[PDB]
Design a protein around this ligand. Structure first.
Ligand SMILES: Nc1ncnc2c1ncn2[C@@H]1O[C@H](COP(=O)(O)OP(=O)(O)OP(=O)(O)O)[C@@H](O)[C@H]1O
Ligand SMILES: [Mg+2]
Lengths: 523, 523, 523
């Protein structure tokens, strides 16, 4: 394209404008008194929403430069939600704050690199402080309390989570499914989960949540790199004859002919999803075995002279359901052979006993944990299909909030934790003055979420912030009841992981953007 | 595509303008002295109408923001007509009123969230007041009086309704069909009705009323989720050979291949409609059985290893006629086996006797009520096909009006009930002053319908409103005769359900719109 | 030409906007926190001053409506400014707050008349509270502090004022002159000041103040009025030989005969001034004698039979310089005779004792006092001439404020009095709600200026205001200290009169602005 190139402050004002549109649109929804946002749809009537993630998804600007600013913050802030299951809007609010004051200082002649070092330092210390402020959430009593809090004070949801976690471990794999009636059901089943997402976003299925569900799919295990459809057609035909969907777990699927056809062609004729095999090197092969035995299928390895051209249906494994997302694949009910699965777990258990290094032992037991761990399936029952569907959503939300809570504890919600740790860091300094203003920039930015929340309440944000800061510990402002108090006692908290991810990612883009001297885009 | 984003008062004036165009166009038709509205048609000569619903359907604005305002109010107001069988225009008039004054207050600096709380409170109390003001309509004498009133004082229509309702219960399923001659006919027949509408609006048949009629259709019962046409083609072919239309009652039909072909392809070759099975969980399966026995067909369940690939015509049930709409499916004459149907009803009746909980008993008898209830078919006879067709329409209307009347009674029509309950709530207050103006905003809005009605009469609306308010009970203004009096005695009333739905939905959008800070639309 | 007229809110908005613009600049400047200010001039090099007013003076609004609205505030403010000597800004600040609220109320549609009444009522109450609150001016140390306030942390000015004040006496008038050199000089000047107006503004000299200063004025004293030229003429002839500027003292000059000839006939190229002789009756004569002695000139009376014509220049005394203002005319230094002046004083002094009556004593004592007191002159040095002018202006302002402050007594500054009174005021209720709101508005207005100072501080005025209100007695916030302490103890006090004056004027303006439905402008 002939390009349009901008440098320094020119590129600065451009990015700031794009960020302000994105942040201002999204932040109106912040807090219990958050306002609505109308998103036009050609499909029919507009959508009125308060989900800041939905709003962000719709933000695209006309000016190429401003749009670059917005798309940058959107990409990083989204990583927060992916990591902690929440944090995107807060990440956006913080990012806008750091970027606004950062660029002001830059334009005032301060050194961008120093400013960033200062911002980065304040964030390091602040994360330490949050870690210290964190209230743990380990015992089943705590787990349930967090669960119900997340489920809008639903004692039943908290119970479900706590029960599932107890029956499968706090770091065990738990799924949520539709109930068969009024009563909730919970049953551990043969399954597994690995950190590998879909190869193509175009594999997204009915689940609007950005995931893909496959009922009774055929699992295809091939440690080869499939770039062409030719040597896979026979399998595809057989699968098609079965009418069942397919899950391709290979070393990697290349977008030359395979991923191309699998997506561009299979837009209705079949249901095929593809993901990379877990791990690398030799472990990649071993793990595929675990998955194979688990699903009862066999792996096609060129090493053994296995040919996908001859891969029959009996080679393919199967599971009651499979759910894949951005960065994870969960095999819910492997049709494997109980004894076979137990045999492998034992085989690996033996290998662990005869391990000659910590690294070997560690990875070895991570594998047995997956196989021997199983999947806990929660079946949300209710009186009506509507209630059932609504409760199910609540359970899914509470489950992600609670898991984050068990991992890093919990902290005063309502934007109070950030304003708390910030008030502590008032004496923090750096290698020099620029670095110092960098530190101040971040500390002041940490007050943005609470001030926004109080803004939507029709209250004075600088007065409430001033008050909350003067307090100590988990003392804050409850925007729901609009009264001060102990945030934790008032049941207003966030998993420390989301507040952390939000701050870190926010500081990440803010740092990159503050140290950007040139922007290039098509005319 | 690049978006155009508006915040605060800017988005405010935009929505208000779009709402005023929609409301002003529709409200000219309000009352006995309502004016006409000409709707251009490319198809030929323009249509002159007084049906406010038809007018609304045509309203689309050029400005993307203003159009969003109009489409919002149209979507919610339509829910009133769907719920109570009327109320859309009143809902629009009220909505415009609440929104107009609400936004004024917002722009005056009042808290949007408070204003909405106040509006919401006044509506809660007002609905209580309407409930108190309601004159019941239960005895057959009342039922007939309401019926004839709705049928433009036709004693025969009232009789028909009362007779049908008596022969099948006030909450029983009653249909209206074309007569075979001069005399009206009424006969209860084997049938059923469940709250499940068409999956695709594109299934609408000849009935312009937004419904779909199917003569002697083949009912296909499958508790599976049909997303692909492949495993259903054989059935479709067989059905095609029969020339009879088809009704697909499945767990859900996904728009991947099935709903896609069934709609996009079957635009003339066949007549196929699809709806979701009633209920969820285990009840979904049980109910499908009821429907199966009722229509004489069998359900295809993967659990039993049933394959749609082998679903022959004998598996499909049949009914004399089936009528599906936005949110309901009515099986008018099941070709089921009398004894079989009686057997099931007995079987379930036994289950009720051995029930171990209120929830079980309740749902169990709801099912027997459907099967054992049957459908009352009214056959509108007349001297000429024109008369027959016109009377039939009257019967259908009177039948919505009367059913709504039996459910929640009846109240002074002519916009008098709303202005009545409002005059009572003059001392109502809230948590604060903003909330108070919120309350006033709603109370003043409740006078809009009557004032509009009187406006179309060429009379002074503030004088008539002032007078009606000073009165008491069902005392109001009869815009037909243009004299004051007792609305109920003058036979000018509305089912309490429509006045309620109108107010609630109106306050709903008005509330959302008043608490909207940002609008996003394509450039 | 044609005028554009606006009515209702539209008129109001223009005024409001205009008011805000003017107010905003003023508000920031006001308070020691605010920085001084320099004013640009197209005319020439920029003018350097430290006045809130000046900013207002500079500010003109392009929009006629806005400008006019702005003008209204300024004019009132100036009036307050003159009387108070200070608090120009305060009035402006107060007015703006009041106006905005009042306008909002107008937006409310409450009848503004009540609001104005309420405001007036509130003002009256506040005034009473203030008066009680106010305490007598403290000693010179306080005076210096008072001076410093006018100083805006100009220590020297306060010192100068105090020093000048001490020597002269508070009662004694102090005059400011440009410094001879960088070092300030304070010289007491012998001479008497008597409060006499200048007959015509025409006489009024070049300087903006309009006080007329004559260099080496010649003083002619006549008891008799100067009827006509002819009697004058022989005086004039001597004067022609003269040509040093002439000052004339006469009991009165009948305007037409003298003035008509003088103005029309006489170019008046030589500077001339006329003043009425101080006092009336014998006392007036006595005063004249005192003046005459001080001048060293002689007075001619009909009773003496001395002729003006006969009287030569020698009879006329000379003064080093004379300054005349409308209120008063003073002679900075008559050449006089040292012995003569002293002798006269003694003679008068003897007379004072001699007279039995108080009345006689008072007149005599007053007469002696004037001569004895003399006038005090203050010179302001500066690094540069420009600075000196700026300094001088500040000094002058301080002096007036100080003088006013002392007589009035001092009240806590910082708008502490205003806030304090308001709380009491709040309890008071207006006759009707509309009045009530207005009353509240006035109270709110009072609070605001405290906030503005706080804002300059950058401290959140809310907390400060709240804290200030909470404290009983004199409780306030010292900007400089940024510590809470008694205002009196702090010694930062604003004059009661100034505070009172500003408030009243602001209220008046605000009320007027609110009332004014319509504005008219030229096209
Ligand atoms: N250290 C201080 N703490 C509190 N308030 C102070 C302090 N020093 C002065 N002030 C206040 O600042 C105001 C005086 O400033 P300024 O003279 O600018 O206001 P103004 O008289 O209204 O404006 P102008 O003098 O331009 O008319 C008074 O209310 C005074 O009490
Ligand atoms: Mg001042």
């Amino acid at each position: 394209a002939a390009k349009d190139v901008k440098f320094g402050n020119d590129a600065r004002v451009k990015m700031l404008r794009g960020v302000n549109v994105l942040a201002d649109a999204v932040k109106v929804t912040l807090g219990p008194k958050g306002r609505n946002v109308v998103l036009d749809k050609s499909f029919g009537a507009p959508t009125i929403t308060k989900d800041g993630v939905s709003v962000a998804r719709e933000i695209e600007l006309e000016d190429k430069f401003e749009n670059m600013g917005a798309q940058m913050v959107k990409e990083v802030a989204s990583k927060a939600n992916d990591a902690a299951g929440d944090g995107t809007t807060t990440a956006t609010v913080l990012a806008q704050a750091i970027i606004t004051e950062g660029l002001k200082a830059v334009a005032a002649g301060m050194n961008p690199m120093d400013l960033k070092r200062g911002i980065d330092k304040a964030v390091t210390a602040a994360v330490e402080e949050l870690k210290a402020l964190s209230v743990p959430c380990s015992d089943s009593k705590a787990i349930a309390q967090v669960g119900t809090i997340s489920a809008n004070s639903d004692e039943t949801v908290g119970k479900l989570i706590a029960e599932a976690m107890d029956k499968v471990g706090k770091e065990g794999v738990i799924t949520v499914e539709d109930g068969t009636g009024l009563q909730d059901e919970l049953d551990v089943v043969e399954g597994m989960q690995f950190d590998r997402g879909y190869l193509s976003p175009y594999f997204i299925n009915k689940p609007e949540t950005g995931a893909v569900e496959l009922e009774s799919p055929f699992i295809l295990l091939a440690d080869k790199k499939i770039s062409n459809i030719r040597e896979m057609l026979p399998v595809l035909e057989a699968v098609a004859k079965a009418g069942k969907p397919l899950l391709i777990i290979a070393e990697d699927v290349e977008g030359e002919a395979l991923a191309t056809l699998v997506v561009n062609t299979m837009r209705g004729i079949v249901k095929v999803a593809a993901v990379k095999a877990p791990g690398f090197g030799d472990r990649r092969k071993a793990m595929l075995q675990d998955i194979a035995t688990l699903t009862g299928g066999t792996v096609i390895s060129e090493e053994i002279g296995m040919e996908l051209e001859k891969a029959t249906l009996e080679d393919l494994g199967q599971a009651k359901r499979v759910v894949i997302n951005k960065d994870t694949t969960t095999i819910i009910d492997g049709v494997g052979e109980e004894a076979a699965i137990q045999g492998r777990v034992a085989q690996i258990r033996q290998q662990i006993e005869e391990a000659t290094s910590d690294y070997d032992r560690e990875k070895l037991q991570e594998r047995v944990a997956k196989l021997a761990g199983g999947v806990a399936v929660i079946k949300v029952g209710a009186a009506t299909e509507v209630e059932m569907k609504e409760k199910k959503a609540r359970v899914e939300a509470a489950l992600h909030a609670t898991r984050a809570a068990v991992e890093e504890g919990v902290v005063a919600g309502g934007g109070v934790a950030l304003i708390r740790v910030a008030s502590k860091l008032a004496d923090l300094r750096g290698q020099n003055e620029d670095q110092n203003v960098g530190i101040k920039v971040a500390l002041r930015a940490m007050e943005a979420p609470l001030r926004q929340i109080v803004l939507n309440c029709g209250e004075e944000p600088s007065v409430v912030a001033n008050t909350v800061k003067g307090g100590d510990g988990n003392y804050g402002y409850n925007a729901a009841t609009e009264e001060y108090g102990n945030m934790i006692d008032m049941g207003i908290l966030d998993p420390t992981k989301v507040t952390r991810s939000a701050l870190q990612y926010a500081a990440s883009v803010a740092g990159l953007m503050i140290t950007t001297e040139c922007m290039v885009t098509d005319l």
